[PDB]
Prior knowledge:
Chains D, E, F: Keywords: Cytoplasm, Hydrolase, Metal-binding, Nickel. Chains D, E, F: Pathway: Nitrogen metabolism; urea degradation; CO(2) and NH(3) from urea (urease route): step 1/1. Chains D, E, F: InterPro entries: Amidohydro-rel, Metal-dep_hydrolase_composite, Metal_Hydrolase, Urease_alpha_N_dom, Urease_alpha_subunit, Urease_AS, Urease_asu, Urease_asu_c. This is part of a larger assembly, with two copies of chain A, one copy of chain C and three copies of chain D. By secondary structure, chain C is an all-beta fold. In chain C, 0% of the residues lie in helices and 38% in strands. Chain C has no helices and ten strands. Chain C is globular and about 55 Å long. Chains in contact: A-B, A-D, A-E, B-C, B-D, B-F, C-D, C-F, D-E, D-F, E-F.
Amino acid sequence: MELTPREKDKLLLFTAALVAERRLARGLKLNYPESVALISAFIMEGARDGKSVASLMEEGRHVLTREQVMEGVPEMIPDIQVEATFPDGSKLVTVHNPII
Amino acid sequence: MELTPREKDKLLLFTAALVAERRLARGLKLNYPESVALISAFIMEGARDGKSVASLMEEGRHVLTREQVMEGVPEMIPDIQVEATFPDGSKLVTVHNPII
Amino acid sequence: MIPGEYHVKPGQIALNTGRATCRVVVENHGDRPIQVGSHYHFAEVNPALKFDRQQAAGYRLNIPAGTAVRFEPGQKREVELVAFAGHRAVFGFRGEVMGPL
Amino acid sequence: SNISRQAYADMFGPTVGDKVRLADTELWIEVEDDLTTYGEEVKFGGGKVIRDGMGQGQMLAADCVDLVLTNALIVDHWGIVKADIGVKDGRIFAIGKAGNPDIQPNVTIPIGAATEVIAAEGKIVTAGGIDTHIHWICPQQAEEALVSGVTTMVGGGTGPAAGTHATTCTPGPWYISRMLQAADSLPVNIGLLGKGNVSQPDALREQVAAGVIGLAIHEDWGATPAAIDCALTVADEMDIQVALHSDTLNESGFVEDTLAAIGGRTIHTFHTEGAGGGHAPDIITACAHPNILPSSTNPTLPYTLNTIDEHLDMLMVCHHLDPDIAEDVAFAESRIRRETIAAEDVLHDLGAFSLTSSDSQAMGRVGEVILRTWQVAHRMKVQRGALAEETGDNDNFRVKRYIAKYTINPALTHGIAHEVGSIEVGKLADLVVWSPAFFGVKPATVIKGGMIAIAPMGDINASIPTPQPVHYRPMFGALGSARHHCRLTFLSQAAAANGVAERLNLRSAIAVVKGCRTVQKADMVHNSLQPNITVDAQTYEVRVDGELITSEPADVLPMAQRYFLF
Amino acid sequence: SNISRQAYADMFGPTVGDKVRLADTELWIEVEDDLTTYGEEVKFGGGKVIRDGMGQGQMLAADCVDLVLTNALIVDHWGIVKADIGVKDGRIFAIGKAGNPDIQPNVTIPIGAATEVIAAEGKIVTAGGIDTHIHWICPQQAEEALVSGVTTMVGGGTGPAAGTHATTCTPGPWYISRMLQAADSLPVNIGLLGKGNVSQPDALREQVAAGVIGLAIHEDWGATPAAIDCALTVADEMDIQVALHSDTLNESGFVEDTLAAIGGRTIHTFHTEGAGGGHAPDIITACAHPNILPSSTNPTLPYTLNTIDEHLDMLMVCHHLDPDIAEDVAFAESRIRRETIAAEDVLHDLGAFSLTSSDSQAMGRVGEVILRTWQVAHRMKVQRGALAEETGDNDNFRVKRYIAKYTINPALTHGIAHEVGSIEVGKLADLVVWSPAFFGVKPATVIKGGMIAIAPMGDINASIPTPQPVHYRPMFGALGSARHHCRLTFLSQAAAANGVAERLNLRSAIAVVKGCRTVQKADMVHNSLQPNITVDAQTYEVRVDGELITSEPADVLPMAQRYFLF
Amino acid sequence: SNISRQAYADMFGPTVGDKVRLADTELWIEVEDDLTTYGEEVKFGGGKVIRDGMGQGQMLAADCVDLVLTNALIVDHWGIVKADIGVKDGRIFAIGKAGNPDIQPNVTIPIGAATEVIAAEGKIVTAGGIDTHIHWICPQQAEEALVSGVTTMVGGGTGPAAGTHATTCTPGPWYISRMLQAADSLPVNIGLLGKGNVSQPDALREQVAAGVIGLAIHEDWGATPAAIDCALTVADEMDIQVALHSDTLNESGFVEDTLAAIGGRTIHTFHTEGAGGGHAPDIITACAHPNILPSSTNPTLPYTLNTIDEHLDMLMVCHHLDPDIAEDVAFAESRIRRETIAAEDVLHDLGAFSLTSSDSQAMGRVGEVILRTWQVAHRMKVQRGALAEETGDNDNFRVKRYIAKYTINPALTHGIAHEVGSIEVGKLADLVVWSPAFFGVKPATVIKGGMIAIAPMGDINASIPTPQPVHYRPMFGALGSARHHCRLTFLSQAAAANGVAERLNLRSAIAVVKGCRTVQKADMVHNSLQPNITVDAQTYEVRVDGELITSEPADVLPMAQRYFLF
């Protein structure tokens, strides 16, 4: 595989997201780290699918709603940023106020 | 658990494979690192089940086909090697030209 | 499209050009196989291989660098040798020369 | 005897006339020359050539090399040739034919008992990359860059602090001393840049005397004519380089006023296209001047479908701007122009822009300098075809022009070309080994000062080093004292004289910079074009000799989704 | 001109009169004072104030600070004020108004070319925490504690050995020397404690002469009157501190016998509540004495629904007890009393208990000292309301009382307050930057000796340092020689005189402890209450002046499930 | 009073007559002797024996040990006994009865204030393993081996280079110096081997003078009679060891010609069975000679169902062979013989083969030397029953014979037995603590030079060190200066005299090798059998005294799937 440090680091994000994903499935209100990991992983897969940066900046705000997370969480996350390999190289995706 | 460095390293391979597994499920054509991780993980589970080295050297060539991976990928992987704890200790499995 | 693919132009490469060569018939009189490398001083190979050692003095196998010629027990075959260059000084092997020639 | 060309290539790698595809791009290199004597190639392994009395001699350590890279395909600014590389005392000894003079002809690189072997047949070998726009935001950047193939890092910073987030400045004697000490722990050659934004010379001289090899001027600290003039005066007297990030706001004047302040003195312009910073919207016109050494930062290389969308938020965070402050967002927007972004790719292809850099974690990706340089070359070949300088049916010249951008040119610009920058005898043995399928993306071996510092490594407990999982791991060249011996800390002539190394008790090898003031655009290898370039104040259109310069945004790029897990 | 208070707070952080919620607790701090001159605040960024000739001057390095933390909200035992913090030579230079005296008024902290900037607007800045109950079971503890906001660690151990599992003792000259050497590799200030359980003075003197800054007496090695008296005699003559873990078994006598043996001499009592160890069931009565410096270990802070259930098995493993041995389980049970556990929280709120510590991996959590101290404050405000000392509608006094518990008080107790413990001029620049939403839970920046040592860091290859995944990573302040320069190894006056540092070839900065014998309960900042406390031998009820002291167990706590992934 | 044997074993571990199962194998050890005085055993914990005036005395540091391992069950080549182990100054002080002479009888190991305690009751303690076939392909190997229980590593290499992939050679003065420097960063004792394949003595002498403790001859560099004779001549004059990997190809002669070249001089034969390399197909016959010190590499230990299938591809990658070159594949196949593989296990059981090693990442698994040695012992007991030397109903003798293979014998072979190799007074305190259920698989504690260097460690933030996840983590013995003090770098007498340590500025303790030429087969502990062994040139059958030697392939093995996650 010849995994570079950045690829191995992203594996940490993916795994963190697996945790949140399961908890959301049980019907729990996600906390701060769970919410960030879940939305971040979503965007990374979006890039793998070949979606544009613009599309994801939008879609990222519809992953989790205010009623699916703990109180105060939406305000603790004014934005979420993550980079992934799009068909045209690495690009930065910034989702403002992801949880509404 | 008393996990040694080699066991923790294999956890990296397993996780990398979880990524590829999900993408293949969506219907994506796997890339180089995804393909290597997917086939490697398969062999490790084979050993856990108690299959012989000889059986896996064969079965490993029928995990992914040329139409399930990106162009050029099959040629970037002339072989795949991975070791796992078989009932009779650690053994090396070498799969030549895994993707056809 | 194949990443890092070569586009080798067709043809052949002539190896060790402009150097003295000679052919020798060799027979393995031992009970075990013997494999000889391209740059090994032929005159100092395993004593079980019977041939004109005097003719093979200062010679090596005229084969592509890194390859070898195997002799199974009792095997007899004619091989082609090419002469050493450089200083033509042989050191090592079975220690039969250990100097120029 | 005789051997077919195909079988030959499979055994010893390609030879004269054979072409090789660079990774998954459309670029093809052709072997221009082969320094071997057919039939006498040295090969290592069980029953191969490199054995006592055969391809290995009886000479003492002093009469043979410490390391030999067999059958390598060299890709450097001076040529694309097949040959063995000899390394002795951590430096490049010779480029020629390795072997034993006792039995082989034309041996220029003697192999003996003291010689280690690295098999490079079928591999491409290049010099280590050099990034001159590092923000020392975190120490982890060195590993990321080393893995990508960059062996020398020049820049400034003190860690994740506001000043370093925005600028490449290691402020003052205390922080400079602290960072010089911390550098001994990093596996890459390092040279620091101080804060050059001051109108009092002595404040700059102290910094140079403390150890910096240059002064970086950034608009965040005020890139005023007075500051610029001050820094250049000190640079002229201490033989150190000045790197500029001009006044985007046009607050103290326009680009012509800055150029006037520079007064024809040597200077390195950062991200000359402007997105990363500079007089809006025409900082790009600086590349027409002889005293200007222009470089690009990587997020704009090459122009793609997602480039623009990504830039606005990136700009804000880097420079500590406020999206709720109208003036902050307007100034951000004035920096992102599709027009200049597209032109930049062409100017690189023409040789008007001479260097490529990252701008690490401040509108730049530390591990993508090499990768992006090649993506630009691919996109330019695809859109513009062969360069006027090409000869034969290959992209050899375009490859030499682009490789020089992150190797020899950065070295010349910062006065360290006497130590690193290319594969030439006497230079430090900073080499990178690449498999053709992964060229520019993932290296097979990264050598520092004659010792492998990092490489892909499989299962530590495996019976061989190839079993999965294979990922990059630190090697002996990155360990304690061996590391110190294989890396360089560059100092200014003043610092070296002042005994800075002894006082700080620096453990690594020391190198001094020189020739920073004498370099000019004409000295940039394969990239010396001084075009008559203009930018329309209203439309932002870039024109050279009146002709419009532009390119199309890529939707898909090579060296991307086929190699990365994320 | 004029600006609204809200817009002002969004730009430069809160000012006088504004209140701020601490994380997700019910504690609110109010800005007591602001040292700025409205309109002259310094801000860094593109086109901001800190630029040449503007907010940055022309002074030489010697006349300006190396680092400035702009617009910080300081929370310390002496005040909750808004101000800029100047740092020079690794130490706190001044707390005031930063800028350029050439054009700005009231500048006390000059910014020049040699000044690095850290933007603290909207952030709370505190001194680094100090944990005085460390069991050196594993080196990994230093990183865990550093990340939590603790910059100084005092304790003993040699690794995961039985003796260290149970006690904070580095036994003898050889192990002390070995640990002093190993300390150079850790990013926190360190002071070692030796085994004080002996009735032969010379065996203790050797240890002090070897390098320990104190002697820890633990019942596992026999906390007998003779041993205690011996250790205190040596402490009195060598100016080092004694930390006690009394005889739970009442084997040599009751608490009054131990107190008698102490004979009014200065001593630090570990986990004074008793769960972590001490005369059953009344060791808690020690906090009434003037010579006793009482502290709590964190697993009992604060009293919650799961506290009791968790304690029995924890006790056994730590002290190597056998659940199959009746006497071992009975002695464990005599240590866990709901009555004393509940009273402890109140005694802290009243200032009867002066310190908080962990008791790392031996009935304590190394990364939860700060976190738990604040949870107790929250639970106490909720249950008891405002303290008698409060003024205004805020929790300012309660905040000063509790912060002193893990900062200045631990420093005073162990004689290192002249070096660390608070944000005061001349002290080492060990600072922690917190975003209000994560106060006490996850720091934004952890500074050691003037260099950032650890901080949250995003994608190393990203275009900015903010993209995910963000997790704590070591910075330059934690690297090799820079680390040595930014940390302190505390030695006893005897060791320092004996040339221990030179003999062991210690690379870090050395500091000497002093004033361990003269400190008394009255010296503990905001926590000097000496209550008339009693414990009922049968019911275990705690009473002060005859009134029953108790509290209710929390079911849910702040700074918990909202911040942690696991 | 009186106590039942079962209750006694649960409290202090097994005593005389009690048997213990080794992990999940069929091997059972029986306690041969107990050095304690019943009723006076020392135990640590709350309210236990090791407390002031009780099991701990008043003596000064000089009169007591630094570390004591209480109630340990020693398993060494000399005996399987119960006793306390005393460690002082990083070396084994005594094996006896620990305590306080003031109140206890027969105390040989005095415990005082300067004594740290490690509770070993119910644990088996052994000496650290010694692997003499290391390929320094990557630094990560040291941790893998340390975790497995191997504390000394002898071999050669420069990193992941072709030469090191195939051979254990650190070529020449420059690389030797570089590796000696890099060794200071590794937590294991190290001794380097140079490239011994040369027919010019001076080229070898330089290497020995540079620092190597031996010369490794490998067929990849040409294992010719001349080279072999040359290396042995230099070895004879410099007191260093020669390790041989003979000519598989029979190119220069057969095994008898090699043996003739050796001329009765002392030499260590690597992987004597042949799969890892050597004259095909009878290199195994070397074990009949008095001057030959034979060892096995681990991938063939023990003969199982998957052994053969796995070997072909492993062979190719290691020696850089080409599967498309007929001669390369034929030579690979001539190395893998079921006949010799099966016989090897029996020859080990008989003591004809004296050592076991890995051959790290080059047809060997670095973390499985100990594990596989025990699997062979299990399979041999199962197939052949009790050894002729056994006494009583236990496997004590077979256990002593096999443990000597990776401990004392490797130490004797390489002339370092005066420093390490067994638990004897005066030797370096390199000890490994094992829980009986995990013996040979996963250690409880690994001690280096008197300091724990690595151990399983749970949640760093937990209240105890036992909570999950538990995995191996570096301890204080592996940190900076403490590491240097607890490890040894072995040098040749010449290097030591030349001041190599001072010139290279080596920080670790130095040890010199001696007695490499005088050791012979008769000196190998419990493994000195010189059998009249023959190999049929055609059928490859191995026969001793005319009787056929063979064994059956295992389908399932102990110390395998029950302990590993992967």
